[PDB]
Structures are given as C-alpha cells and as structure tokens.
Short mmCIF file of C-alpha atoms in Angstrom, two decimals:
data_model
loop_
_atom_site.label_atom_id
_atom_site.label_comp_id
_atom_site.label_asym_id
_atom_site.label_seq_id
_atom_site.Cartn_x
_atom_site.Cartn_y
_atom_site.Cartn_z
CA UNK H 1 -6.73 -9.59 -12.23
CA UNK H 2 -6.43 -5.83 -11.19
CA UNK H 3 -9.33 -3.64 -11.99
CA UNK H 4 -7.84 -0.13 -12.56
CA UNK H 5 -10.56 1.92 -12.41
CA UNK H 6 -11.36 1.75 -9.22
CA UNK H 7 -10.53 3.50 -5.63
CA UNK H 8 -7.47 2.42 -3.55
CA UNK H 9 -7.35 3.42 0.11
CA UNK H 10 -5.29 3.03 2.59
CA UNK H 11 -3.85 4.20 6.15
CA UNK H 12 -0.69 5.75 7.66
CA UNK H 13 -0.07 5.34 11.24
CA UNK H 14 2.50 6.02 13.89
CA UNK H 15 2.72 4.44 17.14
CA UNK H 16 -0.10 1.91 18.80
CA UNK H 17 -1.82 4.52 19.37
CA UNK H 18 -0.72 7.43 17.61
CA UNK H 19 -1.40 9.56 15.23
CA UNK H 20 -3.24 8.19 12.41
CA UNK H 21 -4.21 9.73 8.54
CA UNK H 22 -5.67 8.00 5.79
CA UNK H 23 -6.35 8.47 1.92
CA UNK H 24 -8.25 7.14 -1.40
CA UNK H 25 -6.44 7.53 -4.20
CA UNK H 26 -6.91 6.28 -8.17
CA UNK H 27 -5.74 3.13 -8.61
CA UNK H 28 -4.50 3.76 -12.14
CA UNK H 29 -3.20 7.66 -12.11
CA UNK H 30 -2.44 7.84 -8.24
CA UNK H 31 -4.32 10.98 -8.10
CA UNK H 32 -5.58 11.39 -4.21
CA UNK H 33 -9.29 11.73 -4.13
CA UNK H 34 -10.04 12.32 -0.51
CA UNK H 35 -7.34 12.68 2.46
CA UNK H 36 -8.15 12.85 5.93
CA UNK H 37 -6.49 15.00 8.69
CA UNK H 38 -3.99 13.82 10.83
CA UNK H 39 -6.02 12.05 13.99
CA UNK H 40 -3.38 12.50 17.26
CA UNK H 41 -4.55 9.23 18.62
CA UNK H 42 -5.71 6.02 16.96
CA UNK H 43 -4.64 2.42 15.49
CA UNK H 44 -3.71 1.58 12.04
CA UNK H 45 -6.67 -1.02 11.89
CA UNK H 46 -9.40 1.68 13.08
CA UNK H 47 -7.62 3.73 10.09
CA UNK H 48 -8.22 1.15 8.04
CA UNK H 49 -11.87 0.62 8.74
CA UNK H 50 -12.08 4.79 8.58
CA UNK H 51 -10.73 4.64 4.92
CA UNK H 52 -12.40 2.18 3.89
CA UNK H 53 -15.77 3.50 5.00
CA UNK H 54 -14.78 7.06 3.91
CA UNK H 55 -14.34 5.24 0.08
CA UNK H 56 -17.66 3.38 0.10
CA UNK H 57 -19.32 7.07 1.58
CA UNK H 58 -16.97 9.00 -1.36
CA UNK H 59 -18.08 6.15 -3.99
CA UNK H 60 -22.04 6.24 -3.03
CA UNK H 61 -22.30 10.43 -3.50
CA UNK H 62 -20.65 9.82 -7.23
CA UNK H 63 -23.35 7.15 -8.23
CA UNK H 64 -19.86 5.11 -9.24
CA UNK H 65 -19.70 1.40 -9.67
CA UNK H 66 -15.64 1.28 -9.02
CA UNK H 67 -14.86 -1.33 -6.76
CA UNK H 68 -12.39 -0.08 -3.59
CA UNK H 69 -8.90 -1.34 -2.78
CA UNK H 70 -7.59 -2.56 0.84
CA UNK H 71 -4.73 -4.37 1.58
CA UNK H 72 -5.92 -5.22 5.25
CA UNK H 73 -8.10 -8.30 5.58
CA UNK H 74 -8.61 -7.25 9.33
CA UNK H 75 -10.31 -4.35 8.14
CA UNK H 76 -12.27 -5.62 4.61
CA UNK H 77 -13.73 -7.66 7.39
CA UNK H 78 -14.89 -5.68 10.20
CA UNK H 79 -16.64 -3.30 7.28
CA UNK H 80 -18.27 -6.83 5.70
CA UNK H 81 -19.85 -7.59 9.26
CA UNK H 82 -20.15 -3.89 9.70
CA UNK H 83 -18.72 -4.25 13.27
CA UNK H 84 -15.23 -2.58 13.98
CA UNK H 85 -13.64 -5.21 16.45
CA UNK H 86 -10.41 -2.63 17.83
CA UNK H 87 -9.63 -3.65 21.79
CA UNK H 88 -8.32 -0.14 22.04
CA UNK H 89 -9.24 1.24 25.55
CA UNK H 90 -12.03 4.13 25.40
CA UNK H 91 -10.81 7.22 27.11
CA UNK H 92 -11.13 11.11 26.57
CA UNK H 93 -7.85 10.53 25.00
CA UNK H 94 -9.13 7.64 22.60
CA UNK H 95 -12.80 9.38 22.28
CA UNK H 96 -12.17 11.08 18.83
CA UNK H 97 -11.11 8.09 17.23
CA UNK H 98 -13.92 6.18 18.73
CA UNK H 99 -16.65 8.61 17.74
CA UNK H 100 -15.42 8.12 14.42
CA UNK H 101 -15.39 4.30 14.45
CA UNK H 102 -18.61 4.16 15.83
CA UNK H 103 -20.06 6.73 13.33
CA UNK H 104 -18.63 4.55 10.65
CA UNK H 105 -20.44 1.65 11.62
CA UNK H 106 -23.68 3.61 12.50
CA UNK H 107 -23.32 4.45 8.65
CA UNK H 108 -23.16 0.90 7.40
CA UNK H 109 -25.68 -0.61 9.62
CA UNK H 110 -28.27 2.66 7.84
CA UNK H 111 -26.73 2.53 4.22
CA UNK H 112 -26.62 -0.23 1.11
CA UNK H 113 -23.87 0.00 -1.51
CA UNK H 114 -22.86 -1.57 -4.63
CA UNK H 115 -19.04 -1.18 -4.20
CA UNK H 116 -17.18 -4.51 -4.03
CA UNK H 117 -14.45 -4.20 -1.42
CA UNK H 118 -11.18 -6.09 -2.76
CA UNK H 119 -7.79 -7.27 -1.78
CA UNK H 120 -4.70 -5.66 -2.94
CA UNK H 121 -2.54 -8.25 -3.33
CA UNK H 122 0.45 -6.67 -2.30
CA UNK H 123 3.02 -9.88 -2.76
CA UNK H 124 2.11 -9.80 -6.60
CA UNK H 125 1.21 -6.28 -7.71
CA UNK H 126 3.70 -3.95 -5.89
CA UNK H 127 2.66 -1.82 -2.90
CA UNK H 128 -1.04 -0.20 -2.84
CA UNK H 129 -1.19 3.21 -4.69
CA UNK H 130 -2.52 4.90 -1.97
CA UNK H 131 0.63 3.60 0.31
CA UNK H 132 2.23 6.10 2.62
#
C-alpha cells in the first residue's frame, strides 16, 4: 500500500544529455520540499540518483523516519549499491554533472540512514507527485 507521509522525488530532463532539474515533494499535499537548479548538461538517470540522494541527505538533517519515493528502478539501485553506473562520457562539458554524481556517492559510501527507498508504482497509483 502507499505510505503518504513520506518524500516523493523525482527528475525532469531534456535531451540525452541536456539539461536536467530535479525535486522532493510531499507525497500527500504535493508541497515541494527541496528543488534543484536547472543543470545545462546531464541524464535523466544521473538526475535520478541526484534526487534521490538529495532526499535521503534532506530526510537525515530532519531526524525523519519517512520513507522516499522513486519511480526509477535504475536509480533505487545504483543508490542501494551506492555506485552510480551512467556510461555518460566525462568531459569539461559533462564535469558538473559528474562532480555531483560522484559527490553523491562519496556521501553514501561515509553516511548510514534509516530511510527505506520505495517504488512508485506508477501503473496503479497515477503519476509520482513530484512528476514534471
């Protein structure tokens, strides 16, 4: 079943690469808790791992127990083995993006969290709230 009190994330993306944004929002009111600044060039999937990250980082600060939302499997995964597996290229245009990935995973490798990272089961209970 859904739990709605908890944090629902997700990315928006344009191009492969492009520019890329993500956001956490409240499952049940849709209010946006964090939002991140447009990046000019990166993939919906490092996005993805971003926002999810960004939740479990937004989550930890609040001592909350509120489980976080994803509707991308790719990424739940890559933050479960804490190893973001993008084949983008690495380039000064890509470098940003990359930074940030690999910051992300720096973060989980030195961090422990309680937060239990979920599936939005998009087929079943309508499009994630945090959906661009």
């Amino acid at each position: 079943e859904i739990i709605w009190e908890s944090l629902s994330v997700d990315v928006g993306s344009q191009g492969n690469p492009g520019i890329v944004e993500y956001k956490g929002v409240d499952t049940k009111t849709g209010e946006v808790l964090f939002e991140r600044e447009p990046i000019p060039i990166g993939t919906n999937n490092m996005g993805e791992f971003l926002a999810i990250v960004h939740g479990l980082r937004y989550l930890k600060e609040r001592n909350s127990r509120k489980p976080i939302y994803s509707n991308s499997q790719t990424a739940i995964k890559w933050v479960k083995d804490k190893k973001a597996k993008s084949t983008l290229v690495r380039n000064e245009e890509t470098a940003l993006i990359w930074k940030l990935v690999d910051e992300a995973e720096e973060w989980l490798n030195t961090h422990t969290y309680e937060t239990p990272i979920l599936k939005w089961q998009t087929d079943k209970w309508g499009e994630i709230k945090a959906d661009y």
